[PDB]
Design goal:
Elements (H helix, E strand, L loop, with lengths): L9 E2 L2 E2 L3 E4 L3 E2 L5 E2 L4 E10 L4 E8 L2 E8 L6 H4 L6 E3 L1
Antiparallel strand pairs: 1-2, 3-6, 3-9, 4-5, 6-7, 7-8
PDB class: structural genomics, unknown function
Keywords: Integron cassette protein, Vibrio cholerae, Oyster pond, Woodshole, structural genomics, unknown function, Midwest Center for Structural Genomics
Assembly: monomeric
């Protein structure tokens, strides 16, 4: 999958190698829903300043998921700026 060596190892509360429970269901920029109760391991992030395009990479049951968030008020800044509303460690 994604080349991990390009990824930032921490993004706010998210630390690579740690597992997180989704504590509020949310939909990403691709309009994919992640359901409360889901558990995923953080792999790392990448931010593309031009598009305000934040990618949060996770492992879920062995499959790589790219959660894409557009970090703008009208899109998903809400999620990117309040990650502890959405993810809880353990």
């Amino acid at each position: 999958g994604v080349d991990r060596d390009y990824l930032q190892s921490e993004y706010g509360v998210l630390k690579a190698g740690q597992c997180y429970k989704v504590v509020r269901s949310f939909r990403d920029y691709r309009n994919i829903n992640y359901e409360r109760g889901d558990v995923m391991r953080f792999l790392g992030s990448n931010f593309v300043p031009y598009e305000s395009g934040l990618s949060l990479f996770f492992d879920k049951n062995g499959s790589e998921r790219q959660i894409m968030l557009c970090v703008r008020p009208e899109f998903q800044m809400e999620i990117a700026h309040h990650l502890d509303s959405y993810f809880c460690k353990l």
